[PDB]
Design an enzyme around this catalytic site. Structure first.
Site, PDB file in Angstrom:
ATOM      1  N   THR A  34       0.189  26.708  31.465  1.00 44.92           N
ATOM      2  CA  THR A  34      -0.924  27.264  30.748  1.00 44.92           C
ATOM      3  C   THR A  34      -0.993  26.825  29.312  1.00 44.92           C
ATOM      4  OG1 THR A  34      -0.269  29.453  29.911  1.00 44.92           O
ATOM      5  CG2 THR A  34      -0.596  29.212  32.224  1.00 44.92           C
ATOM      6  N   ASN A  41      -1.650  18.059  35.376  1.00 49.35           N
ATOM      7  CA  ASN A  41      -2.684  17.517  36.218  1.00 49.35           C
ATOM      8  C   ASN A  41      -3.001  16.059  36.003  1.00 49.35           C
ATOM      9  OD1 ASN A  41      -2.880  20.170  37.016  1.00 49.35           O
ATOM     10  ND2 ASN A  41      -4.706  20.584  35.850  1.00 49.35           N
ATOM     11  N   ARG A  45      -2.703  13.430  39.132  1.00 45.05           N
ATOM     12  CA  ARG A  45      -3.843  12.721  39.636  1.00 45.05           C
ATOM     13  C   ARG A  45      -3.633  11.227  39.477  1.00 45.05           C
ATOM     14  NH1 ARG A  45      -6.727  16.640  36.418  1.00 45.05           N
ATOM     15  NH2 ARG A  45      -6.876  18.444  37.784  1.00 45.05           N
ATOM     16  N   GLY A  84     -14.992  26.166  35.611  1.00 42.68           N
ATOM     17  CA  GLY A  84     -15.943  25.364  34.882  1.00 42.68           C
ATOM     18  C   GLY A  84     -15.408  23.972  34.651  1.00 42.68           C
ATOM     19  N   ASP A  85     -16.233  22.973  34.909  1.00 42.94           N
ATOM     20  CA  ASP A  85     -15.818  21.594  34.748  1.00 42.94           C
ATOM     21  C   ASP A  85     -16.814  20.756  34.003  1.00 42.94           C
ATOM     22  OD1 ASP A  85     -13.262  20.992  36.045  1.00 42.94           O
ATOM     23  OD2 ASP A  85     -14.230  21.961  37.707  1.00 42.94           O
ATOM     24  N   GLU A 123      -6.729  17.899  46.174  1.00 45.07           N
ATOM     25  CA  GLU A 123      -6.538  17.767  44.739  1.00 45.07           C
ATOM     26  C   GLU A 123      -5.086  17.683  44.375  1.00 45.07           C
ATOM     27  OE1 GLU A 123      -8.797  17.689  41.949  1.00 45.07           O
ATOM     28  OE2 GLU A 123      -7.020  17.377  40.803  1.00 45.07           O
ATOM     29  N   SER A 128      -6.846  25.645  38.157  1.00 44.20           N
ATOM     30  CA  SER A 128      -6.942  26.883  37.432  1.00 44.20           C
ATOM     31  C   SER A 128      -8.265  27.544  37.734  1.00 44.20           C
ATOM     32  CB  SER A 128      -6.820  26.619  35.949  1.00 44.20           C
ATOM     33  OG  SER A 128      -5.810  25.694  35.671  1.00 44.20           O
ATOM     34  N   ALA A 138     -16.450  28.813  33.052  1.00 47.93           N
ATOM     35  CA  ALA A 138     -17.587  28.672  33.929  1.00 47.93           C
ATOM     36  C   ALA A 138     -18.959  28.657  33.293  1.00 47.93           C
ATOM     37  CB  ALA A 138     -17.517  29.692  35.041  1.00 47.93           C
ATOM     38  N   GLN A 169      -7.880  35.398  30.391  1.00 46.34           N
ATOM     39  CA  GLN A 169      -8.725  34.545  31.171  1.00 46.34           C
ATOM     40  C   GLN A 169      -8.846  35.044  32.586  1.00 46.34           C
ATOM     41  OE1 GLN A 169      -6.765  30.617  30.251  1.00 46.34           O
ATOM     42  NE2 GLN A 169      -8.682  30.396  29.306  1.00 46.34           N
ATOM     43  N   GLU A 171      -6.893  34.649  34.951  1.00 51.22           N
ATOM     44  CA  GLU A 171      -6.557  33.491  35.770  1.00 51.22           C
ATOM     45  C   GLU A 171      -5.862  33.664  37.113  1.00 51.22           C
ATOM     46  OE1 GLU A 171      -4.763  30.340  33.574  1.00 51.22           O
ATOM     47  OE2 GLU A 171      -4.630  29.026  35.284  1.00 51.22           O
TER      48      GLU A 171
HETATM   49  N1  LIG Z   1     -11.734  25.895  34.347  1.00 48.43           N
HETATM   50  C1  LIG Z   1     -11.740  27.163  33.978  1.00 48.43           C
HETATM   51  O1  LIG Z   1     -12.794  27.809  33.766  1.00 48.43           O
HETATM   52  C2  LIG Z   1     -10.395  27.807  33.799  1.00 48.43           C
HETATM   53  C3  LIG Z   1      -9.455  27.198  32.978  1.00 48.43           C
HETATM   54  N2  LIG Z   1      -8.247  27.742  32.765  1.00 48.43           N
HETATM   55  C4  LIG Z   1      -7.265  27.083  31.890  1.00 48.43           C
HETATM   56  O2  LIG Z   1      -7.682  25.756  31.544  1.00 48.43           O
HETATM   57  C5  LIG Z   1      -6.725  24.803  31.994  1.00 48.43           C
HETATM   58  C6  LIG Z   1      -7.256  24.035  33.218  1.00 48.43           C
HETATM   59  O3  LIG Z   1      -8.668  23.815  33.109  1.00 48.43           O
HETATM   60  P1  LIG Z   1      -9.254  22.654  32.148  1.00 48.43           P
HETATM   61  O4  LIG Z   1      -9.226  23.175  30.741  1.00 48.43           O
HETATM   62  O5  LIG Z   1     -10.560  22.164  32.709  1.00 48.43           O
HETATM   63  O6  LIG Z   1      -8.122  21.517  32.376  1.00 48.43           O
HETATM   64  P2  LIG Z   1      -8.091  20.698  33.747  1.00 48.43           P
HETATM   65  O7  LIG Z   1      -6.781  20.002  33.945  1.00 48.43           O
HETATM   66  O8  LIG Z   1      -8.620  21.570  34.853  1.00 48.43           O
HETATM   67  O9  LIG Z   1      -9.177  19.580  33.343  1.00 48.43           O
HETATM   68  C7  LIG Z   1      -9.308  19.164  31.975  1.00 48.43           C
HETATM   69  C8  LIG Z   1     -10.478  18.205  31.879  1.00 48.43           C
HETATM   70  O10 LIG Z   1     -10.371  17.314  32.977  1.00 48.43           O
HETATM   71  C9  LIG Z   1     -11.468  17.495  33.856  1.00 48.43           C
HETATM   72  N3  LIG Z   1     -10.978  17.530  35.236  1.00 48.43           N
HETATM   73  C10 LIG Z   1     -10.428  18.584  35.858  1.00 48.43           C
HETATM   74  N4  LIG Z   1     -10.121  18.270  37.144  1.00 48.43           N
HETATM   75  C11 LIG Z   1     -10.493  16.996  37.358  1.00 48.43           C
HETATM   76  C12 LIG Z   1     -10.441  16.026  38.482  1.00 48.43           C
HETATM   77  N5  LIG Z   1      -9.959  16.358  39.700  1.00 48.43           N
HETATM   78  N6  LIG Z   1     -10.923  14.779  38.249  1.00 48.43           N
HETATM   79  C13 LIG Z   1     -11.443  14.409  37.050  1.00 48.43           C
HETATM   80  N7  LIG Z   1     -11.516  15.239  35.993  1.00 48.43           N
HETATM   81  C14 LIG Z   1     -11.064  16.520  36.085  1.00 48.43           C
HETATM   82  C15 LIG Z   1     -12.072  18.852  33.531  1.00 48.43           C
HETATM   83  O11 LIG Z   1     -13.476  18.939  33.753  1.00 48.43           O
HETATM   84  C16 LIG Z   1     -11.793  18.944  32.060  1.00 48.43           C
HETATM   85  O12 LIG Z   1     -12.864  18.259  31.406  1.00 48.43           O
HETATM   86  C17 LIG Z   1      -5.465  25.555  32.365  1.00 48.43           C
HETATM   87  O13 LIG Z   1      -4.560  25.524  31.272  1.00 48.43           O
HETATM   88  C18 LIG Z   1      -5.919  26.986  32.604  1.00 48.43           C
HETATM   89  O14 LIG Z   1      -4.955  27.924  32.113  1.00 48.43           O
HETATM   90  C19 LIG Z   1      -7.909  28.884  33.350  1.00 48.43           C
HETATM   91  C20 LIG Z   1      -8.771  29.572  34.189  1.00 48.43           C
HETATM   92  C21 LIG Z   1     -10.104  29.093  34.505  1.00 48.43           C
END
Ligand SMILES: NC(=O)C1=CN([C@@H]2O[C@H](COP(=O)(O)OP(=O)(O)OC[C@H]3O[C@@H](n4cnc5c(N)ncnc54)[C@H](O)[C@@H]3O)[C@@H](O)[C@H]2O)C=CC1
Ligand SMILES: Nc1nc2c(ncn2[C@@H]2O[C@H](COP(=O)(O)OP(=O)(O)O)[C@@H](O)[C@H]2O)c(=O)[nH]1
Ligand SMILES: [Mg+2]
Lengths: 205, 177
Positions: A34, A41, A45, A84-85, A123, A128, A138, A169, A171
């Protein structure tokens, strides 16, 4: 039928019901991810799940996998969770301008839909998510995904300092190599605002 | 190690997301700019203490006024930003930002940050701001503002060039302790 949490009260109550007694090392591994998830990741990947290149992570990952692998570590009911992505999630060819002035480029959107709709994916990275929709990323990103999580799935729920470096969050963290199917990809408008956002519905398999 | 929380607020496009990025990657982003930056804990030491500072990015737009508050609980310091290239944003400091913070983080130390310091002596800016009878904010104005709103300190920086960035965080860190 899957549970969807209306508010913090529901989010909080559902949270109490989850497993929280991870081992200290277990707690540490979850909290470490976290702090920064880019390192876990991005690497996985890039390397497709082979941990041999960086031993220093190997333990790091191998270690988190366990916390998440404990038998007590699963979810009781069927819960909808959200994430959210950024637009690049769908490939390096895209950016956030995909949405300008609250409009999603249809030409761009359609290509994405053909490419990804109905697709089943594996994946490498952890996923997360948040049980509360308003929490998390999101609403602040271009693509919002709702994951339908089947009961018995293995995960860690974190909303406290012991567990995460970002309490608040709500989470739910799913294990790496989790496989999901994208049922639908669509555009939806936000209540009270005029911005469209790309919405994804995916189910965990 | 000591755990502290920092939340950054400010008007949209005033440069918030970029600031944190550059803080953790020494790389100004140019093509894949996230609306809101991801979780990152900054490792900092000042006056002999090692601190782990979690940084929370936020969306300053009104659209997100409802959601922002979920980021405020238990905050140790705030970075209130505005853009030197925009006097409009600075006015929003008193107008929108200070009121919201005092409400949600009543006793939290505030550090006022002037972003985009590189646009202070930028012809395009100057001229562009000229079309409205305004000019880039002066350093005296920010300090004045910080004093007005009760900020612990005031800083300027430029993510684009990285000027003072490292400084903003160190200060934030001191105030956090
Ligand atoms: N996404 C959310 O709304 C949530 C995020 N989090 C926190 O955020 C972190 C994980 O989410 P992110 O901040 O998005 O980091 P992430 O590792 O999920 O992705 C970071 C960046 O890479 C992009 N990405 C994610 N998965 C991908 C894939 N398979 N291929 C290409 N690009 C990808 C995402 O859109 C983001 O721009 C964790 O530390 C977690 O604790 C926690 C709960 C929900
Ligand atoms: N000239 C200049 N532009 C910047 C700087 N920081 C950010 N920007 C630009 O200002 C815009 C807003 O930045 P961003 O960090 O997304 O703002 P946020 O919405 O407040 O997070 C972006 O287009 C950046 O390219 C800076 O230090 N100097
Ligand atoms: Mg931003």
């Amino acid at each position: 039928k899957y549970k969807l949490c209306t508010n913090k009260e529901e989010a909080d109550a559902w949270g109490k019901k989850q497993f929280n007694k991870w081992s200290k090392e277990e707690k540490s591994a979850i909290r470490d991810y976290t702090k920064n998830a880019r390192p876990y990741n991005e690497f996985l990947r890039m390397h497709a799940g082979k941990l041999d290149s960086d031993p220093t992570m190997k333990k790091k990952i191998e270690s988190l996998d366990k916390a998440l692998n404990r038998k007590e570590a699963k979810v009781n009911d069927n819960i909808k969770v959200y994430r959210g992505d950024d637009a690049w999630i769908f490939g390096k060819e895209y950016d956030n301008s995909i949405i300008k002035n609250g409009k999603v480029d249809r030409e761009k959107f359609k290509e994405i839909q053909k490419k990804f709709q109905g697709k089943t994916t594996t994946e490498f990275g952890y996923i997360s998510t948040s049980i509360l929709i308003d929490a998390g990323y999101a609403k602040t990103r271009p693509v919002m995904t709702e994951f339908k999580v089947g009961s018995g799935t293995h995960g860690a729920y974190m909303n406290s300092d012991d567990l995460t470096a970002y309490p608040g969050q709500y989470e739910l963290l799913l294990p790496r190599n989790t496989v999901y199917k994208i049922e639908k990809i669509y555009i939806a408008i936000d209540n009270n605002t005029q911005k469209e956002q790309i919405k994804v519905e995916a189910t965990i398999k | 190690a000591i755990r502290k929380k920092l939340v950054i607020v400010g008007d949209g496009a005033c440069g918030k997301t970029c600031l944190l990025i550059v803080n953790s990657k020494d790389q100004f982003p140019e093509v894949y700019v996230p609306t809101v930056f991801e979780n990152y804990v900054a490792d900092i030491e000042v006056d002999g203490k090692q601190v782990e500072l979690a940084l929370w990015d936020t969306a300053g737009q009104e659209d997100y006024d409802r959601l922002r508050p979920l980021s405020y609980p238990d905050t140790d310091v705030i970075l209130m930003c505005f853009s030197i290239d925009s006097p409009d944003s600075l006015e929003n400091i008193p107008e929108k930002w200070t009121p919201e913070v005092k409400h949600f983080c009543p006793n939290v130390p505030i550090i006022l940050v002037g972003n985009k310091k590189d646009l202070r002596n930028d012809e395009h800016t100057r001229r562009e701001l000229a079309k409205m009878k305004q000019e880039p904010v002066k350093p005296e104005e920010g300090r004045d503002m910080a004093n007005r709103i009760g900020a612990f300190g005031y800083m300027e920086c430029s993510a684009k060039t990285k000027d003072g960035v490292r400084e903003v965080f160190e200060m934030a860190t001191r105030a956090a302790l």
